[PDB]
Amino acid sequence: GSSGSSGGHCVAIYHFEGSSEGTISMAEGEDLSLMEEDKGDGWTRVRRKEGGEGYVPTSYLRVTSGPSSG
């Protein structure tokens, strides 16, 4: 079957390196798996295909918002 999961889709907008003792790194335009939403906090937790998840700034997250993904 297809390879995906209906729930939350987001991609890194700008290069964000997780230096702090509690953050994840992503690549400009990289696919991520939304896990923990951000409520007026600006912090979102996403997972990586490999197996790494951390708290990234929503500002650096652009909701794919692209249905009918062929």
Encoded tokens for 57? 């700034």
Distance between CA atoms of 48 and 67, rounded to whole angstroms?
21
What 3-state class would DSSP assign to 54? strand
Distance between CA atoms of 65 and 39, rounded to whole angstroms?
19
Quote the radius of gyration of the chain (alpha carbons, Å). 12
Place of tokens 């003792």: 21
User: Domain residue spans in the chain?
Assistant: 1-70
Region 1-70: CATH code: 2.30.30.40
